[PDB]
């Protein structure tokens, strides 16, 4: 897939992703906070269409992600991220996608997610997160 | 003066300031790096004119500031930053202004200057720096 | 179980743990690096015995942990850490314990594990890790 790297920012304001109930996660875009001002990240789109859009609007800065979890699994011969769930200090968003395969989860006791990087072809191949105080 | 706070970024690419041999530092503007892309900071200008402009273009990312020094003093009854000097791992820029008054200096052994905040009226009233690894 | 919190240090030199291949992880103790000198952490012991000891001596500072993975699941009625695996830039240590249940893994692209905290009763109930640059 096509790799992307948004880099690190001051916080997260909104997450826009898309998924397909039969395959995996497709598009991924984030609206970050940059020293108090919204900063719209590049939209990282799947090579195909047919996904269901989801908008996660956080009440920045009182609301922030405390845990990210999901599943990775094989889809058409490719290992991809099939599902994502975001838990903030206020509520849980998800799961979005297919909850099948190998689970993973990153709970955070102290600190914040401030950026994302990864790769997307037909689906989200993989991703990493920038963490900071 | 009018306060400003650029916030924190990924690094510094260029510094644009102005000074006057008889008074103090006037205008101050920084071109930061934001995850590999230049980000033009707001131009913080003096309420008056008659300053000499200076452009410090750093060879980012191989060149970075290792020490900031200067002088604070009284000008027309106001305590302001009268002079500034920027030393990088490659060269020394300055002093710009008048080196009279009380000196100050911030040498950095490990870390980077990644942002500025302060206040400017007729001249640069005061300033602070964001530091990060 | 009895909660513990070693805090943060400068790095990791050695990890001493005990496990039972048919139940879960038992004892846990870490020899940290504290500014260039070894610092022997408190030994957090299980309430019971019958575990197999393991000593993981790292070639500090050239060798460091790049990924921690394992499994969690029930042992009797309690949810505990059944297995752990430590992967460094040189070798893979483990898995130690029951490699069944719900997997979890923490790969580190940039940064270091510099401390541990958790709880141990009959077995390691849960644990968290301090991360730093």
């Amino acid at each position: 897939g096509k790799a992307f790297d948004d880099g690190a920012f001051t916080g997260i304001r909104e997450i826009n992703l898309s998924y397909n109930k039969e395959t995996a996660i497709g598009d991924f875009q984030v609206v970050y906070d940059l020293n108090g001002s919204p900063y719209v990240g590049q939209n990282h789109k799947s090579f195909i269409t047919g996904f269901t859009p989801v908008k996660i609007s956080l009440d920045f800065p009182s609301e922030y992600i405390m845990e990210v979890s999901g599943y990775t699994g094989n889809v058409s011969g490719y290992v991809v991220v099939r599902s994502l769930t975001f838990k903030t200090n206020k509520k849980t968003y998800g799961p979005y996608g297919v909850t099948s395969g190998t689970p993973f989860n990153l709970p955070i006791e102290n600190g914040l997610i401030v950026g994302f990087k990864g790769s997307i072809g037909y689906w989200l191949d993989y991703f990493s997160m920038y963490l900071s105080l | 003066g009018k306060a400003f706070d650029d916030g924190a970024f990924t690094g510094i690419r260029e510094i644009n300031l102005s000074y006057n041999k008889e008074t103090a530092i006037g205008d101050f503007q920084v071109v930061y790096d934001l995850n590999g892309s230049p980000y033009v900071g707001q131009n913080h200008v003096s309420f008056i004119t008659g300053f000499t402009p200076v452009k410090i273009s750093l060879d980012f990312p191989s060149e970075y500031i290792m020490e900031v020094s200067g002088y604070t003093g009284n000008v027309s009854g106001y305590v302001v930053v009268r002079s500034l000097t920027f030393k990088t791992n490659k060269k020394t820029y300055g002093p710009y202004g008048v080196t009279s008054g009380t000196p100050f200096n911030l040498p950095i052994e490990n870390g980077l200057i990644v942002g500025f905040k302060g206040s400017i009226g007729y001249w640069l009233d005061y300033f602070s720096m964001y530091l990060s690894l | 179980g009895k909660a513990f919190d070693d805090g943060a240090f400068t790095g990791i030199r050695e990890i001493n743990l005990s496990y039972n291949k048919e139940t879960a992880i038992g004892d846990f103790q870490v020899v940290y690096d504290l500014n260039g000198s070894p610092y022997v952490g408190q030994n957090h012991v299980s309430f019971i015995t019958g575990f197999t000891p393991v000593k993981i001596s790292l070639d500090f500072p050239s060798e460091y942990i790049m990924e921690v993975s394992g499994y969690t699941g029930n042992v009797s009625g309690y949810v505990v850490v059944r297995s752990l695996t430590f992967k460094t830039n040189k070798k893979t240590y483990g898995p130690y314990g029951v490699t069944s249940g719900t997997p979890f893994n923490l790969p580190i692209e940039n940064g270091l594990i510099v401390g541990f905290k958790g709880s141990i009763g009959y077995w390691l109930d849960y644990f968290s890790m301090y991360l730093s640059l």
């Binding site: 990864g118 993989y126 | 191989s62 | 893994n105």
Partner: peptide
Amino acid sequence: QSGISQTVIVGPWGAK
């Protein structure tokens, strides 16, 4: 050093 600020990065999860 380089003039580029660093931050902790965890992952990746998904394809290798």
